[PDB]
Every structure is written in C-alpha cells, then in structure tokens.
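request received
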Amino acid sequence: NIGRELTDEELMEMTGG
Amino acid sequence: NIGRELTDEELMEMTGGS
Amino acid sequence: KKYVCVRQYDLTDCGAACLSSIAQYYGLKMSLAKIREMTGTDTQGTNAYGLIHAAKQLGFSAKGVKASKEDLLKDFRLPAIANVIVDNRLAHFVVIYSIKNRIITVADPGKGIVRYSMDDFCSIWTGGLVLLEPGEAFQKGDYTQNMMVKFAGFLKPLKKTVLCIFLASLLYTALGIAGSFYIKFLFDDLIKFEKLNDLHIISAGFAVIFLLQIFLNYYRSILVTKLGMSIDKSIMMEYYSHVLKLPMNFFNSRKVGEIISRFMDASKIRQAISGATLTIMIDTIMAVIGGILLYIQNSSLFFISFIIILLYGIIVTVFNKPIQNANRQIMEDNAKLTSALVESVKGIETIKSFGAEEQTEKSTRDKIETVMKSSFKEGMLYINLSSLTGIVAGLGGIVILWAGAYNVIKGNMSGGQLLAFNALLAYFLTPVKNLIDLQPLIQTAVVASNRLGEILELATEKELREDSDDFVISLKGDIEFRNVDFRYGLRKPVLKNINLTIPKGKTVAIVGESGSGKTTLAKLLMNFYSPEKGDILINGHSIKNISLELIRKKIAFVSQDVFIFSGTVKENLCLGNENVDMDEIIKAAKMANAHDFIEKLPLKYDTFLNESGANLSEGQKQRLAIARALLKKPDILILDIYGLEDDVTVIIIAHRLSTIVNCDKIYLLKDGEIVESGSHTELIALKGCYFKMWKQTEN
Amino acid sequence: KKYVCVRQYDLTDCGAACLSSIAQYYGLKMSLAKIREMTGTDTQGTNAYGLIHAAKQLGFSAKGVKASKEDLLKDFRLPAIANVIVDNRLAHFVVIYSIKNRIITVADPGKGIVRYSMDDFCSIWTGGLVLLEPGEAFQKGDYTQNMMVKFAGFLKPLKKTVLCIFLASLLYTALGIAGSFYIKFLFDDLIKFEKLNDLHIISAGFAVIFLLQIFLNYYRSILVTKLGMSIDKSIMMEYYSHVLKLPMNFFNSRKVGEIISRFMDASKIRQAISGATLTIMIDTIMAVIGGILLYIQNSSLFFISFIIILLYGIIVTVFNKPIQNANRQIMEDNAKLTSALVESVKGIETIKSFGAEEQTEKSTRDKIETVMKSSFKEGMLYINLSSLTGIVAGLGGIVILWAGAYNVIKGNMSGGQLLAFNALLAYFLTPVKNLIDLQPLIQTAVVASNRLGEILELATEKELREDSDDFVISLKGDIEFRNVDFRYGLRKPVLKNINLTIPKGKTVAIVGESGSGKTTLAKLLMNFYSPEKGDILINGHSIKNISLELIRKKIAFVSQDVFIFSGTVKENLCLGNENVDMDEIIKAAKMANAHDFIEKLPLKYDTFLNESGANLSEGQKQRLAIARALLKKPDILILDIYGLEDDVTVIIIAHRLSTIVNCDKIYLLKDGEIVESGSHTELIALKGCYFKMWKQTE
Ligand SMILES: CCCCCCCC/C=C/CCCCCCCC(=O)O[C@@H](COC(=O)CCCCCCCCCCCCCCC)COP(=O)([O-])OCC[N+](C)(C)C
Ligand SMILES: CCCCCCCCCCCCCCCC(=O)OCCCOP(=O)(O)OCC[N+](C)(C)C
Ligand SMILES: CCCCCCCCCCCCCCCC(=O)OCCCOP(=O)(O)OCC[N+](C)(C)C
Ligand SMILES: CCCCCCCCCCCCCCCC(=O)OCCCOP(=O)(O)OCC[N+](C)(C)C
Ligand SMILES: CCCCCCCCCCCCCCCC(=O)OCCCOP(=O)(O)OCC[N+](C)(C)C
Ligand SMILES: Nc1ncnc2c1ncn2[C@@H]1O[C@H](COP(=O)(O)OP(=O)(O)O)[C@@H](O)[C@H]1O
Ligand SMILES: Nc1ncnc2c1ncn2[C@@H]1O[C@H](COP(=O)(O)OP(=O)(O)O)[C@@H](O)[C@H]1O
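response:
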C-alpha cells in the first residue's frame, strides 16, 4: 500500500522504451 | 553526323545513372 | 532466490523484459515475443497499463502506484518494476530487487544486474512503481523451447557432407602429425650419421605428405563453405517465409529495422550450428591425440604445455566479459553519432536559416570524442589481453626449450625429440585454443537463436482465423457495424462505439477530422485487424467466418499512401496475379486515366520504376494504385476511377466536405463514434456538427 | 594512346565520369566534383543536355544525336558517350573508344574497360550518342590536387609520436633478432657440452629480453592507437566543418548516405596515412637487416627464402584484382537484397491485400541465391590464394630444412645455425610480406582520399558571395522580383521571367497549383539559391549586396515540412542563439498557441523529443516551428499576424483559396509567371484563370 494508486489515464502516461 | 540530331527538349529525356 | 535479468532483444522491449524477469523469478518462463504482445508493446514502447494488463493476464496480482523517496524505505514486495530516465533523454524500465540499506540493486534489461546509491536511484527514479504478486491463479511452468536443438535439425539433410568433412579433417590431422617428425629424423638420424642418399628420399616423402595435406585442406574448405551457404539459405528462407504470414499487429508493433536485423541472426546461428559442431567433434579428438603424443615424448614438457594452455584459458575467460561490454558501448555511441549526423544533414535548411552551424559542429565534435573514448577503452582492453597472452606464450616457449635442453643434458630425450615436441605442440595447443575460443561464439549464437526463433513460434494470420465458409462467394450486400471497439495495442480506444449500416451497392462517405479513425474502419473492414468487442457483418454474415482469401480478393483499398515496388509498370499492376490478359491491363489503366503518361514514358508498359517509383510523381503513383485496384475487380472499394458496375459498394474517406456532396449517404465520425448520418441535405438541415464544420471550413 | 577510364565515386555520377574520362583523354584533367556540378548531376543522375552544356563550358564542341546499328561503323570521332539500358533496369553512360572488326570497346565507369560484341552492345545501346571534339577555346592542364600530400600534412603536428613509435619498433626488432639465437646457443654450445648452470643463466637472460620486447610492444601499441584516433578525428572534423558551409545546391544534388560515407572514407585515408608510412619505414629497415643476417648465416638458404617471398608476392599480386572485383559484386548483390527486403517489409499491407506473399518469397529467394552465388566466387578465390600460399610456404620450409641439412652434412653450417636461420626467417619474410600486402590498402586509401578531398576543394556559401555593403541593417521594404529566372540544376526552368512587387508591411499571398513553384520564390527570397537571370530587391538594394548573416537572421520561413531536432523543447526553440531568457520563449509560445501542449508534458520546456520529435505529431511541430520563427524576430515572414510590428511583411503560400480571401494582395503563379495580381474581389471578377480555379476548388 505504497503511495497513491494511479488511474488508467496516469497508468497509460508513464511509459518506457 | 551519325544519326538524327536530338532537339534541346528531347536531350533532357536521354538520362543516365541513378 | 537468484536474481533473474532478462536482456532485451530490441530497443523498445523494456517492460516486456522486466515482466519476463519477474515472471521467471517466481518460476514462469515464457518467450519474450509472447510477453511483448501481451504487454501491447509497440514502436513507442510499453506503458504501465500494458504491464498491469499482461501481469493480470499471467496470473499475477498487479497494481500501479506513484511513490516518493521516503516511500522506498517502507517494506513491500521484492520484484517491483520501476520507471527511470537515463541521461535525462528517454524513459526506461528496471526491476528493483532488494534494498539492503541506502543501496538499490536493480536488474536493468539493457546492461545487467547493477547497483546504485539511494541518492542516485532517487535522482533517476521517476516515482512510479509497478507492484506485482504471484496472484492466486498463477501456475509455475516453462513454456519455452530449445532454439539450438530446433536449428540443429538443418544438419540432418547434410550428414554426408558432415561425414566427409570429418574424414578429411582426420586425414589432415594424421598427415600433419606424421610430418611433424621430419626435424627429428633430420637431426637424430640424417645429420648425425651424414646420410646424404637417404636425406633426399625422406625429404621428398615429407614433401609429398605436405602436398596431400594441402589437397585435403582445399577439399574440406570447399565443403565447409558449401555447408555454411546451405545453412544460411535455409534459416533465412524459413524466417522470411514465416514473417510474410504474420498478422498486421506484428508489423505495426515493430520497426522495419527490427524485422530486417534478424537476417544477420541467421549467420550467427549458422556459426555455432556448423563451425562450432565441427570444431568440437574434430578438435576434441585432435587435442586428445596431440596430448597423448606429447606425453609420450616427455611428461614434464607436456605438463608445462598443459599449464600454458590453462593460463591462456584463464586469461581469455577473465577478459571475455569486459570485452563484450565495451563493444556494446562503442555500438551505442556510434549509433548516437550516426543519428546526429543524419539528422543534421537532413535538416540543413533549418540549420542554415537559424545560423546553428557552430552548435552542430560542437555537438558532432562531442559525439566523435565520446566514440573515440569508447574505442580507446576497448582497444586498451584488447592490448592488455594480447600482452598477457603474448607473455604466456613466449615465456612458455622459452621454458619449454629450457626444460627440453635440461632433459637432453640429463639424457631423458634428444634434440630431435625436442624439436618434434615443438611441432606436436603446434598440433596440441591449437585445438584446445580453438575449443576455448568457442565461448563468445556460442553465447552470441544462443542469443541470436532465441531472438530469431521466438518469432517462429508466433501464430500466423491463417492460424488465428476461425472456421471459414464455403457458401459465401460474393461480398456484395450490406456492411453493418455492431458495437465495434478497437485499440492499437493497449492504447486509447480509436473507436468507442460504432454503429453504421452501409446500403447495398451504394456510395457512402465517412467524414471526420484528422485522427478521427476513418482509416481504422477501412483497415477493420478488410480484416487487417480485429475489433476487441463487436462485430462486422457483410450481407448478414460475420466478417470472421468468411474466407480470408476472399476477403482480401474482393475488397480494394486505395489510400494517399500508395506502395510501388521496384519493377516494370505492368509488374506493379499485376501484383499477386500471374495469368492476366493485357487487354484487361490497358482497360484498367484507361479507367484509372493512367494510360496517358505511361505511354509517354519510354518502353510503354515496361518502364522500370527506380527506387519505388521515384521518377514518377505523387499524382501519377496514385493512378497506378487505382488501376491495380480496378484490376482486382472488387466488390467493396474504399477510396481516400469510378467505372465499375453499380453493384459494387463504394466507400469514400476524406476530410473535405465538398467532393462528397453527391454521395448517397454521409457518416460523421467524431470522438470515435458516428455522431450523425444521412444525406448531405439532411445533415445540413439537422444543424449538427456537420453544419458546424461546413461553416468553419467550407463556409 | 592510352584509354582513360575514370571510375565512379557514387552511383549518380556516370555521365560526369564519362565526361571526365573524355577530357582526360584529350589532355584536360579536373576533379570529379567540379565536373559533376557543371553537368547538373543530382539525385536522378544526369541527362545529355547537362553533358553538352558542360562540354561546351569545358571548351569542347559537342552535340547529341540518335544513331542506329547502320551508323555505328562510319567515320566519326572515336571517343563518344553512349547510353545503355543495362540489365533492362538501369540507364547508364559509357564511353566508346574504338570500333574495328566489329568489337565495341567501352569504358564503363562502374566496371572498367570492357569489350562487347556488336550484338550485345546494340542490345544494351539506346541509340543515343554524344559527339565531342576539342574546339578553338580548348586549354589543356592538370587542375587536380594530390590528396595524400595534405592528408599526410595532418601528420606534421604529430611527428614526435611517430618518432617514438619508430624508436620503439627498432628496439623491438633488435631485441627479437637478439633472442632468435637462443636455439643456436642451446644446440651448438649448451646441449653439446652439457653445461647446466650456463643453461639457466642464458635462459633467464633471454626471458628478460622477451619481457622487454613485450613491454616495448605494449608501449608502441598504445602510441599507435592514440595516433590513429587523433588523425581520424582531425580528418572527420575537417570534412564536417567544410560540409556545413557548402551551398544548398550541394545538398539538393546528393543523398544523405553520399555525404555520410565520407566518414568511413576518413578512416580509409588514415589507415594509409598512419599504417602505411610506419609500415614502409620500419619494415624496410627490418627487412634489410634480416636479409643481411640471413645472408651471413648462409647464402643458399637466403636465396631459397628470397625465391619463396618472390613467389608469394607474385601470387598475391596476380590474385589482387579478381578479389576486388568479386567483393564489389558481392556488395552490389547485398545492396539489391537489402533493398528488396526493405521494400517488401514496408509495403507488407499491399502484399497481403493482393495476396503476393508467394511471389515476394520467390523473389527474395532468387536474390538470396544470387548473393550466395556471388559469395562463393570470392570464397573460391580466397581458397585458391590460401592454397597456393600454403604450398609455397610449406614447400619452402621443407626445402630450407633439406638444404640446411645438406649444408650441415657438408660442413658449411651447424645444426644450431640452421635452427637460428629458421628462427630468423620471421624477421625477413614477415616485413617483405607486410610491404607486399600494402597494395590493396594504398589503392583503397587513394580512392577514399580523392572522394573526401574533392569536396574540400568546393567553394563555400560565403566564398561565392559578392561585395556586400555594411549599410543595410534592416530588410523592411518592398520586395521586387525583376525578370527572375530559375531552374533546379540543369533541368527544365521552374520560373520563367518572374516580375512582381510585394508592398512594405502588407500581408500578401502566393497561390497556384501543386508543383507550380511557389516554394521556389520563398527559397530564392531567403537567398538559398541565386537566380540565373534577373534580380531580387529588398528595400531597393539588391539581395546579392546584403550580408548573408542579415538575410538569414531577419527572414523566417515556416513550411509544412517542419524539422525538429533531437533535444529539449527549449533547445529546439533556441536553435542558433543561446543568450535568450525564458520569458521571451514563453511569450513566443503564447503567441504561437504552443504553450498549452508544452505545459501538459512530463518536463515542461525540458521534455526531450527523441527521434526528431517522435512524441509529437503534425500540429505541434508546426506550432514549435512558428514559435521558433517568432523568437527569430523576422522582418519578412513566410508561412504555409502573431504579434509582429504591423510593418513586417508576411507572405502566405497555399493552394486552398478559402484562407487567402482576406489577404491584401494575391499573386497567381501559372506556367512560371505571376499571371494575375490583385485583391480577392478583383481577381474573382472577370479576370480569367483565378475565377476558374476558384470555381473548381469549391
Ligand atoms: C627492402 C625490401 C622491400 C621489398 C618490398 C617490395 C614489395 C612491393 C611490391 C609491389 C608490387 C606492385 C605490382 C603492381 C603492378 C602489377 C601490374 C599487373 O597487371 O599485375 C598483373 C599480373 O602480375 C603478374 O603477373 C606478376 C606481378 C609482378 C610483381 C613481382 C613480384 C611482386 C613483389 C616481389 C617481392 C620481392 C621482394 C624481395 C625482397 C628481398 C595482375 O593482373 P590480374 O588482373 O590481377 O590477374 C592476372 C591473371 N592472369 C595471371 C591470368 C593474367
Ligand atoms: C608431384 C607429386 C606430388 C604427389 C602428391 C599428390 C597430392 C596432389 C595435391 C597437390 C596440391 C594441389 C592442391 C591445391 C589446389 C589449388 O590450390 O588450386 C589452385 C587454383 C588455380 O586456379 P586459379 O589460379 O585460382 O584460377 C584463376 C584465378 N585467377 C588467377 C584468375 C585469379
Ligand atoms: C597422465 C595422463 C596423460 C594423458 C594425456 C592426455 C591429454 C589429452 C588432453 C585432451 C583434452 C582436450 C579437451 C579440451 C576441452 C576445452 O579446452 O574446453 C574449453 C573450455 C571452455 O569453457 P570454459 O572456459 O571453461 O568456460 C568458463 C565458464 N565459467 C568458468 C566462466 C563459468
Ligand atoms: C593431463 C590432463 C590434460 C588435459 C588437457 C586439457 C587442457 C585444459 C585447458 C582448459 C582451459 C580452461 C580454463 C578455464 C578457467 C576459468 O574459466 O576460470 C576463469 C575464472 C573465472 O572468471 P569469470 O567468472 O569468467 O569472470 C571474471 C570473474 N573474476 C575472476 C574476475 C572475478
Ligand atoms: C606455385 C607453387 C610453387 C611452390 C614452390 C616453392 C619451393 C621454393 C623452393 C625454391 C627452389 C629451391 C631449390 C634450390 C636448391 C638448392 O639450392 O640447394 C641448396 C644446396 C645445394 O648446395 P650449394 O648451395 O650449391 O653449395 C654447395 C657447396 N658444397 C656443399 C658443395 C660445399
Ligand atoms: N499504425 C498505427 N499504430 C498505432 N496507432 C495508429 C496507427 N495508425 C493510426 N493510429 C492512431 O489511430 C488514430 C486514428 O487515426 P486515423 O484513422 O489514421 O485518422 P484518419 O481517419 O483521418 O485517417 C490516430 O490518432 C493514430 O494516432
Ligand atoms: N530540391 C529540389 N530539387 C530538385 N527539384 C526540385 C526541388 N524542389 C522542387 N523541385 C522541382 O521544382 C518545382 C518547384 O515546385 P514547388 O516550389 O515545390 O511548388 P509548390 O511551392 O507549389 O509546392 C517542382 O515541380 C519540383 O519538381
């Protein structure tokens, strides 16, 4: 239970590659 | 004088190399 | 447990590699090419949403949070995919395994297992974490296969060639070992007793032996070359034949360079399939025989030789890993420099306009300096390795001569025996050195075999298709979309809810703004992609149950992005069709109105189009595509000309509102849904969004 | 009289190479770059008109004709230029040199001197011919410069390093030659007399000698690596700095790969600037010393070794050329295969739509078969070369041992001396073999040096500038095009006598169809290109007499082909200038309404746009370009009224007439002329073409 659970909009925003 | 003289417009149609 | 780091195969599979590493940590091994498509990886990369979706699809309980520096010190799950930004340029994914105290150990898919200070990691860390647990429905397994065993099956039709190479190598080795005693016979027998008559006969015999050895080397070199050519051709053609059958989501999620770069993997696989196999099975026997002979000559000198080869092996093994790390850094720096050079040459207009020539010179100078530094690091590594190997070899030779002289003085051997030992050394140390030098080759070939053969496991387009129908032959009818949804690989949904019916044998036009999705409907109607939810019906029949060949044959799509391949004008028009009459070709070219400039071109319908029709203009290339589509003689025609029968359905995709006034029906697509539909007059009178965009654009 | 065959440096310079070959045959030698730029060679090659134009410029009298097989045997100038359709896939230029007994001799710039039959030549021949002959205004000479001279002049600052490498190499050679006598001391003196303590002492001494040799090799390798990197960096940076100053006709006429391959040419040059010089010096001295020592040991064995190295050199020299030809063929086949693979992968959707997977598979299989066939021909060449070299080396070693044993039996030598001779052979055969092996390295370096250094002789953009008065400080005023003529290279003219006037501070627009030449006016206004006839005037003064810095600084051009460089948003918006404060960039972004999307980014004004703004799309890159142009603060702005000063001229280029109605003046560009000029109401009246395009467009 660390920090704040990110929403689908925020999940789709932190990328990599 | 071997052949028909090419015109100045038709000369640009005789290209080569790419 | 052990820390698993799965290295990347390409430049944009960071999240897939991290998920694979975490899955393998808990005992679930899968190919990277399957996890890469589960995560929705594409050209841009992977987002945390794809990682969560794939992990939940893998049985893991997945969650995504944004944390702070102090949140790390708290206790939580071990694997912990994390987001970083290296060089402040591009985002990246790593796996933070454990936090002992102030030290962060991470599996980086691009480098390996590395360790950062807490401050350094917190500097590069972006605060985003992907928490993973092995769920409740997570089952352990190993769903991979040995690629090297798979590619070793190409040797089965070449058993005769392999046997011939083996026999030639055995004869070559035997003749060389026999010829290594010439100097012993010289010094011990001929020179000592002044046998002039024999000298000539023995010398001629050894010359004949050497000539036979040369002939055997010639023959086996030809055989090895032919074997390698065959294996390369087989692997390359198998890979290409499989790639040509894969769905469109394979090509849209990968670059052209990624697909083409695996043609160089075939050579790497061949190296260990053929050369390494030959080296093992030949040099093992050769080294055993050479060591037996050396031990027969002298035990102490054989022990010295064994120590020499052991030291060489230790040095090479120690220098193996550092050398491959520096080469990768050089390749990365060279790629950066090449990108900078190409990008500055292509944008010379802007550089000259803004006067940014000194800036470009400085940037290129800095990148060249970086490349030179990396090259010097690798060169220093190679120089150190060569110096150590040379020390070992030269001192070993000197010590061998020293101990041989000592033994000759003591009477254990003779000078001719010492020189014969020096030759049999050349027939002993070389096989073991060749066997030792197989580690980089085998490692590279294993990596390449996995990289190439994980794609051969991918299901083809025909395999994924369900049962077809042998009673649907014509696609004429009504095209209807029932609650169609679509996304381009775990991204924002292009279409949110699509409901539209296209009347039979009519002309319709879908209107919208840039990025509305009209091209997506065009692709979905041709089964290039499948809707994630909904259905597409053509004359009361599901789009999935119609034969794929019929779907591709009876539907034509002409876009502004035409594709012309190198070949004659007739060859481009006859793409995929072999037996076609020339009258049909000229009729289609006349209908497409491309029959004028083609005749203007030399050779008429044989003009080779250099570099994808570079000589032709944009307006001309479109007309060839239209002629090709008309030659296909389709039932549905999607344009972005009109001379077909009225029965064919015609669909028009355009952002302009003027050329489609006469269309029978107009569908307005906004925000991924069909907001308005009907004829032009009805939409104009309806005072909908069509009226707004008509007043804004066309006034 | 020798037949001169100038080879190609690139793919599109066949006609330039042919004209250079003819000129050299007639006694005029020039660099290929100047001839290439006179012929109008570009990315599509050159045509006949360019060849006659350059020949007339070069003092020749030239003409172009179309002949037949009946005219290919009459009396005419023996050296001519002929057009071929090689492979029925590529048009190309060759030079005809002699026809007699029905055998055509042609210099092909891509292959060399070749001889076809009448049938094959007439099969490939197009019938076109260029006839040339020296005229009254013909001047011979040699205007080409030696490039090895200057690329070795780069070695002048690094002479101390070369001297250190030389001294280390001589010390290494002396230590190795001294250590070559260990086997002689063993067999002749230590083993024979059973001296055990002396054995240990001499063995330790020779071990120390070998260790010193290893240290010297370490030091020399470090120095050589550093010298090579220094010379590579110097050549590369010189080439790049000169290239960045060249005019835009240098970049329009060449591809990106053509400009980039000179970076590999730099390393090719260095391999002979550094490697060949040190090799020649060190190995010549070492070979002489080793030969003297071998002759002292035994004359007959020395003669045998000399014959060995002579045979090796003969074999290598004979095999040199076919290996190069096979390698060239292999590279060509690899290029064709890669092109086919890239085309098939890029156009996979069309292949799937038309069901041409089997045809593409068969075509790629055929190209792979061709590549493999070309690779086996070079493989067999190397196998034959290695087999002959191995025969020579092994039989020479056997014969050396045979003759040495004969001499030892006859008392002319000793066994230790024979073993020492075998050890010393490494210091005579290796240097001469290395000297022989320099033939492929020096020819390649010469070709690379010519390729790279012919560009460095080209005039830069500032050099070609005329006299510029330093009184003009602003470009605000009427823009006049007087009788402006232009053509891209030696092609058909694009602008035929443009004459127009753009008022001061007014928003005017240029309309026309696609490909009319509207962008050409903008490019000429920015002085990227100069008009071949006519003049362009800003504020009365001629554009040629205003400093290039002011022209490039006070004129901005934003088109659809926006280029964004790999860097932060602030870095791209601050291209060219760095002494800019953030409030100015904020104001420009607000004016270009680009502020919002930059704000909603991971790092506002610091987001790194990888792969030339791959994150952004068409619509944001244009806004970034507009913001950058506004930061430029131009007196003339060309677009495809944000802030400004109400006297800054704005010129709009478009083909959709809807957005031009409000423009003060509208210039219709047809057939290379400004046919109609006026307001929207005036032109839409009974004027002619403008009404036609207005009614057709909407
Ligand atoms: C201090 C000592 C330093 C010495 C270093 C000096 C080394 C510098 C050397 C430089 C050599 C430069 C040669 C270039 C010119 C060749 C021209 C040519 O056309 O060749 C042609 C033939 O060639 C031959 O047939 C034989 C060549 C004669 C070379 C003599 C021996 C080489 C060196 C001896 C060394 C002795 C050293 C002794 C030392 C004691 C090539 O034609 P092709 O198309 O390729 O194929 C031919 C096929 N065909 C056969 C069917 C026809
Ligand atoms: C005299 C008694 C000896 C008895 C021993 C019997 C064993 C016989 C074997 C001999 C060795 C021969 C094997 C070597 C084969 C070889 O090495 O073959 C050379 C190729 C010659 O052909 P090549 O010159 O390459 O063709 C033209 C190429 N080029 C010049 C145009 C470049
Ligand atoms: C007294 C009896 C006398 C009999 C004499 C007979 C001698 C016969 C000798 C043949 C042996 C030849 C086998 C050679 C095998 C070989 O030479 O194999 C190379 C090893 C390469 O693999 P390696 O370097 O060990 O990998 C490192 C891995 N790791 C440590 C990094 C984890
Ligand atoms: C009488 C019997 C005759 C048999 C003849 C057979 C010949 C045997 C020759 C094998 C040579 C193989 C040697 C391999 C040694 C080896 O493989 O050991 C290397 C050390 C591990 O180094 P490594 O982990 O790879 O990396 C660096 C890590 N570190 C050390 C820097 C910390
Ligand atoms: C294309 C493949 C060809 C490969 C061939 C390579 C072979 C290289 C060998 C060169 C010819 C060597 C033959 C020379 C033989 C010779 O030269 O034999 C030396 C000994 C003769 O004795 P000699 O030197 O005349 O001194 C006599 C003094 N004394 C003893 C009477 C006191
Ligand atoms: N090959 C692709 N891969 C991923 N996304 C794509 C691809 N092609 C289009 N898209 C996305 O789908 C959306 C639909 O755009 P598109 O249908 O091409 O517009 P239009 O209907 O005007 O042609 C776009 O916003 C684009 O970002
Ligand atoms: N960089 C170039 N190199 C060679 N030819 C060019 C180049 N740019 C344009 N052209 C040719 O010159 C003509 C100029 O037209 P252009 O200025 O592109 O029209 P518009 O401004 O309406 O797009 C075009 O027909 C094109 O064929």
